[PDB]
Amino acid sequence: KIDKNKVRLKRHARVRTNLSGTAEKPRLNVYRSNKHIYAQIIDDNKGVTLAQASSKDSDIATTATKVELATKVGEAIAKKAADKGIKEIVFDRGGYLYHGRVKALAEAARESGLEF
Amino acid sequence: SSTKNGRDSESKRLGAKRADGQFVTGGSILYRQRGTKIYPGENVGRGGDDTLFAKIDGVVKFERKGRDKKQVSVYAVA
Amino acid sequence: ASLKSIIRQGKQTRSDLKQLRKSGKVPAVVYGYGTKNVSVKVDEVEFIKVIREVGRNGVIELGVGSKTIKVMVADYQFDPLKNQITHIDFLAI
Amino acid sequence: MLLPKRVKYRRQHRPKTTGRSKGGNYVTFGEFGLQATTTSWITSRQIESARIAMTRYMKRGGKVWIKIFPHTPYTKKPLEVRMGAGKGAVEGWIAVVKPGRILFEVAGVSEEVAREALRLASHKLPVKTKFVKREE
Amino acid sequence: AKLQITLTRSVIGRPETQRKTVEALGLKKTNSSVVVEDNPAIRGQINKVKHLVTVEE
RNA sequence: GAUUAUUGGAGGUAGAGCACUGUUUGGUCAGACAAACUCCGAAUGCCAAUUAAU
RNA sequence: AUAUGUUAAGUGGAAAAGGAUGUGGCGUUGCCCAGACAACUGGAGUGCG
RNA sequence: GACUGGGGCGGUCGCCUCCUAAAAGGUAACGGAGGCGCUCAAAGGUUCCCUCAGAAUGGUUGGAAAUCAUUCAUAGAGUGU
RNA sequence: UCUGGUGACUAUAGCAAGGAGGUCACACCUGUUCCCAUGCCGAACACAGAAGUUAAGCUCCUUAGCGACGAUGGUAGUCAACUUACGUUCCGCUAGAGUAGAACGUUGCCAGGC
Numbered sequence: 212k213i214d215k216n217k218v219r220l221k222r223h224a225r226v227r228t229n230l231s232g233t234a235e236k237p238r239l240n241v242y243r244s245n246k247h248i249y250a251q252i253i254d255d256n257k258g259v260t261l262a263q264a265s266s267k268d269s270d271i272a273t274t275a276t277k278v279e280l281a282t283k284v285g286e287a288i289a290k291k292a293a294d295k296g297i298k299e300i301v302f303d304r305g306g307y308l309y310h311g312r313v314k315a316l317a318e319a320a321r322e323s324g325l326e327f
Numbered sequence: 328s329s330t331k332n333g334r335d336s337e338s339k340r341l342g343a344k345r346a347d348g349q350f351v352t353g354g355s356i357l358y359r360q361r362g363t364k365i366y367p368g369e370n371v372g373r374g375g376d377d378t379l380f381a382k383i384d385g386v387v388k389f390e391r392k393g394r395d396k397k398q399v400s401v402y403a404v405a
Numbered sequence: 406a407s408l409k410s411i412i413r414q415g416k417q418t419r420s421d422l423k424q425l426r427k428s429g430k431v432p433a434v435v436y437g438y439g440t441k442n443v444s445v446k447v448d449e450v451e452f453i454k455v456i457r458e459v460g461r462n463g464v465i466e467l468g469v470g471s472k473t474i475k476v477m478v479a480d481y482q483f484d485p486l487k488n489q490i491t492h493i494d495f496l497a498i
Numbered sequence: 499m500l501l502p503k504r505v506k507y508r509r510q511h512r513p514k515t516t517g518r519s520k521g522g523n524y525v526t527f528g529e530f531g532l533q534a535t536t537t538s539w540i541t542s543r544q545i546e547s548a549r550i551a552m553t554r555y556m557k558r559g560g561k562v563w564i565k566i567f568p569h570t571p572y573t574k575k576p577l578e579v580r581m582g583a584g585k586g587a588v589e590g591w592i593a594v595v596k597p598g599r600i601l602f603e604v605a606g607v608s609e610e611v612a613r614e615a616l617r618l619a620s621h622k623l624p625v626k627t628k629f630v631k632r633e634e
Numbered sequence: 635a636k637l638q639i640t641l642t643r644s645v646i647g648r649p650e651t652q653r654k655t656v657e658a659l660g661l662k663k664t665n666s667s668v669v670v671e672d673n674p675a676i677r678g679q680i681n682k683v684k685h686l687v688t689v690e691e
Numbered sequence: 692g693a694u695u696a697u698u699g700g701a702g703g704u705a706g707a708g709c710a711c712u713g714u715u716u717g718g719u720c721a722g723a724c725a726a727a728c729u730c731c732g733a734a735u736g737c738c739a740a741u742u743a744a745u
Numbered sequence: 746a747u748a749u750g751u752u753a754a755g756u757g758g759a760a761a762a763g764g765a766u767g768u769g770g771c772g773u774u775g776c777c778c779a780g781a782c783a784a785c786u787g788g789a790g791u792g793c794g
Numbered sequence: 795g796a797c798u799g800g801g802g803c804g805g806u807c808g809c810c811u812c813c814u815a816a817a818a819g820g821u822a823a824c825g826g827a828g829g830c831g832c833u834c835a836a837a838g839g840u841u842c843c844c845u846c847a848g849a850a851u852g853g854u855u856g857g858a859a860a861u862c863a864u865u866c867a868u869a870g871a872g873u874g875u
Numbered sequence: 876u877c878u879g880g881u882g883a884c885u886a887u888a889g890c891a892a893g894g895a896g897g898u899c900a901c902a903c904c905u906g907u908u909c910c911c912a913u914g915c916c917g918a919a920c921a922c923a924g925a926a927g928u929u930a931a932g933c934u935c936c937u938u939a940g941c942g943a944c945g946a947u948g949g950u951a952g953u954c955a956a957c958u959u960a961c962g963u964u965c966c967g968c969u970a971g972a973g974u975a976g977a978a979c980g981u982u983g984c985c986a987g988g989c
Contacts, residue, residue, distance in 0.1 A: 212903080213919080214932070222843080231882090242880065244901065245924095251986065255882060260986035263880085267900080267988075276923060308842075310911070311921055329805050330584050330824055336810050342819055346738040347700035358701090361811095365701090386740095389700055393885080397701095420966060422949085429772090434948045436976055442947050450772075480975060482949065485523050485533065485630065486598050492949040494975060502714055509826060511726050511814075516962045518951080520707075522723060527716095537962045567715055569724050581799055583824045593724090596962085624762080651694090652955095658694040658745060668745090675744040679695045681968090685956055 223306035230303050231255045237297065239288070239320075241305035241313055247272065248281050248312060250288055252297065262291045281312040285319035293324045300325055345387055350405050353384045357399055365389070368400035406455050407466035407473065410445040431490045435469055435476055437497030443469050449490050467495055500542045500568055501591050509585055513570055515539070519596040525632045527563050528603030530612045534625040539592040542568040548619035552602065555615040560606035568593040595625060635671035636691055643686045655682045 230238060237254035251263040264287040266272045266280055271287070274280060292300070302320075307313045321327050341359045345351050358365055359378050367373040368390070370383050381387070385403045392398050413432060422432065425446070433447045445467070455465060456478075466473035476495035484491055515537050525531040545564060552562055568591035575586035595601065602619065604612045613629055620627045641661040645653045659679060660668045670676055680689050 212932070215902085216933080238881095240881070245903095246900085249880065249987090251880070253881065253986080258882065258985045260881080263987050265880095265987065278922090308911095308920065328584050328824095330826090332826060332828095333806080333824080334828095335812090338820075340819060343701050343738075346740095348698095348740050349738090350741095387700095418967075423965090432949075436947075444948070483633075484950095486535065494948075496976065504713080506713055506725095507727075507826075511826085513725090514962095517706095520724090520951095526722065527718095561717090563717060565716070565723075567724080569714060583799090583805090585825065621763085626762090654693060655695075660745075670745065673744055674696045676695085679745080682695065682955085 219306040221306075223303075226304055226306060230301060232301050234259075235299060236301045237261060239300055239302045241303065241307065241316065243307065243312065248277075248284060248316070250284065250316065252288065252292060252300070261297060262288055262295055264288045264291070278312055278315055282315045282319045285316040286323045289320045289323045289325040298326055300327060302327070347387060347389050349387065351381050351384065351387055351401065353382065354380060356380050357387065357401075364397075366392075366396060366398040368398035370401040370403070371399050406458055407468070408447060408452065408455060409468050410447055412470055413444040413446050426489065426491075431493060433493040433495060435467065435474065435495045435497060437476070440469075440474060440497045445469055447493055452490070452493070464498070500545060502567075502569060505569075505571065508571065508588055509573060510570055512572070513539075513592075513594045515594060515596075517596060519598040522565060522600060523598045525600055525603055525630065528561070528605035529632050530604050530609065530616070531600045531630045531632075532602040532616050532620065532627045533598060533600050533630050534595045534623075534627050535597045536625045537594070537596050538624050539572075539594055540566070540568075540623065540625075541572075541590050541592050543590070544623055548602075548622045551618040551622060552604070552615055555618055556604070556607055556611070560604055560612075563603045563605075565600055565603065566593045566595065570594070600630070601627065635669050637670055637672055637676065637680075638690050639668050639670070639680070640688050640690070641666045641686065642688055645686075648686075652683055652686070655679060656686065659687075661687065 231254075232238065233254040233256045237252050237259075240249070240251045240253060242249040247266040249265055252261045253259065254261075264284055266284050271280055271284060300320075302317055304313065309317070339359070341361070343358055344356050351357065357371065357379055361377065363373070363377055365379070367379045370381065370385070371379055372382050373379045379399060381401045383401060383403055385401050386405050388400050388402065390398055390400060410433070425432070429449050430446045431449045431452065433445050435443050435445060456463075459465065461478070464475060464477060467476045474497045476497050478493065479496050480492075480494035481490065482492040483489075523533070545566070545568075549562065549564060556562075570592055571588045572590060572592050573586040574589040575584075601623070602616065604615070607615070609631075616627075616629060639659060639661070641656065641664055644664055645656055659670070660666075680687070
């Protein structure tokens with residue numbers, strides 16, 4: 212192969228010259244795998260993580276292919292995040308094209324109270 | 328015989344205008360340069376023709392970050 | 406054979422080094438196992454009467470405060486216009 | 499006639515001639531050398547004349563390594579001219595020595611032959627040299 | 635206090651920094667004097683012009 | 692306003708070195724040269740703190 | 746005046762490449778009691794006419 | 795018309811970058827070495843992805859530099875002038 | 876601690892040869908029914924996913940050959956001073972570049988499951 216993860220960190224580093232905002236515009240990480248999708252809200256004030264979702268727990272990831280999770284894993288943050296007291300987020304692509312599972316999570320996040 | 332030479336451009340005053348540690352105001356010019364010898368840092372904006380200046384008014388620092396690269400930052404409280 | 410040195414204590418200026426080499430003695434330093442950077446003086450007329458018995462790579466027994474700490478000759482420092490020796494590096498084995 | 503093929507600039511500033519030699523103080527190939535003790539320029543005609551003088555007395559029974567080369571060119575303007583209005587063309591090529599630098603080396607010949615073979619070349623060079631053998 | 639200083643050599647023929655330093659110590663003419671207590675600042679100004687003045691206790 | 696003492700920082704001279712651009716002697720190894728070469732790089736000077744002493 | 750060593754050219758009181766058994770200091774070597782170097786008596790080897 | 799190591803004759807006059815310029819800026823000579831008096835309707839704005847020169851091996855041998863694939867590369871290509 | 880995300884100290888973290896491991900996960904891997912993709916190509920970016928394996932990647936460990944880091948000691952320069960014209964000397968500060976010894980197979984932050 213051509214190091215599928217080592218090319219993403221090359222693409223992620225050129226996304227994130229701008230987007231590293233703090234304390235009212237936090238990032239919202241995205242990541243993928245062959246099986247899952249991971250996400251967490253962070254901001255760069257020497258390390259603060261506010262909410263962290265996943266798709267490996269005993270709540271989801273018992274269901275069909277990859278996307279009805281990734282539309283309903285957006286609301287796993289979007290339930291917790293505004294109930295932690297966050298609003299006015301910024302989202303990164305994480306190195307991926309805004310498409311498919313990543314396009315599903317972003318649109319589903321602001322439909323249930325995580326405004327942009 | 329003759330000379331084909333002489334003929335120079337005059338000058339452009341091109342160096343550090345403020346120094347490390349002093350209170351600079353909201354629009355002071357902090358460096359004049361060709362290219363980016365010294366990068367813009369935080370609360371510092373790189374202008375067109377690469378002459379980096381300050382944005383919020385506070386102290387200045389010239390700080391190093393890489394192997395052979397440098398940056399200029401401005402911090403708020405004095 | 407073996408040298409027999411003293412300890413060059415304190416630290417002194419370049420004129421006192423320049424008043425030292427007229428008496429013949431060449432400064433040196435010793436490092437290595439447990440020696441921890443002692444500074445000596447080496448007499449050049451006596452230091453060459455050692456080299457023609459053990460070689461340019463031999464083993465000597467340098468007495469730094471009556472401690473024959475069995476050093477080797479690592480580095481010269483030479484001046485070709487005046488034909489002397491300027492600084493010698495010993496390492497303890 | 500020792501000169502470089504191409505130089506990036508034909509008119510250079512004059513080299514500095516005070517201090518002591520940068521490097522090239524020790525005999526490293528041969529067995530007997532000729533180190534200068536005074537500073538001067540040498541202008542590549544007085545190396546054609548001190549090389550051949552060493553060659554004849556040796557009867558070509560050894561090797562000769564010259565360890566300097568004129569890199570820097572030096573200018574001059576023709577006679578009966580006024581000052582200024584330019585800078586003159588290249589006349590020749592110089593090489594700077596400083597006291598300590600080995601000039602010549604020999605190898606493959608005896609000592610008492612080479613000591614009377616380097617004297618025939620120091621009288622065609624300006625500087626005061628002496629006879630240095632190898633580091634032992 | 636201590637460190638009685640005295641100006642002996644004059645400032646006629648000396649640079650612009652070796653005249654400002656002498657005027658800092660309070661030395662006007664030849665064979666003037668001051669009495670100033672020892673410091674890291676005063677005892678650093680003395681070797682600036684220690685070829686001019688004489689310092690004594 | 693000036694002067695040192697302590698402190699921070701900008702910058703590529705002297706010197707030195709060939710890692711680059713050109714020069715160069717003897718068999719990848721040993722050696723050399725540089726105003727318009729630099730992996731490096733002082734001594735001083737310069738701008739400052741709003742800190743103490745004259 | 747004093748305590749110590751150096752210079753013999755008027756050096757001090759005009760300047761170089763090179764030459765030089767002038768003289769004083771600091772070191773290093775090889776022969777020397779079988780008494781040494783110098784003079785002194787009877788091996789294709791160093792200049793000669 | 796003026797500068798001009800007397801005047802004439804030759805040369806040069808404004809803007810740009812380097813060196814002399816002495817590690818802040820500044821700094822002269824008829825000192826050393828080059829350009830400019832324009833060009834782009836995409837070679838401008840923004841968004842999403844890709845990384846180069848050459849070297850070496852192989853084969854219609856187009857010297858492996860026409861085109862063609864693999865390694866090695868640390869910036870040795872390129873950036874309207 | 877032990878794995879994964881994620882920024883920091885930024886070759887003392889690197890590069891290269893060896894050696895070990897895998898339902899917890901990351902991968903490798905099969906597919907084109909569709910959104911989506913090639914200026915040639917499911918190689919890639921997407922997208923579906925019973926099965927197939929530790930081989931390369933990543934992960935852990937050790938060897939210091941290469942790169943990086945690097946004292947003390949001395950020299951080169953040099954601000955100030957004193958004679959001096961000599962390709963200078965003597966005295967007092969500061970202190971290089973190269974070279975020897977050596978440090979070195981990373982020290983840590985925060986949320987998530989063991």
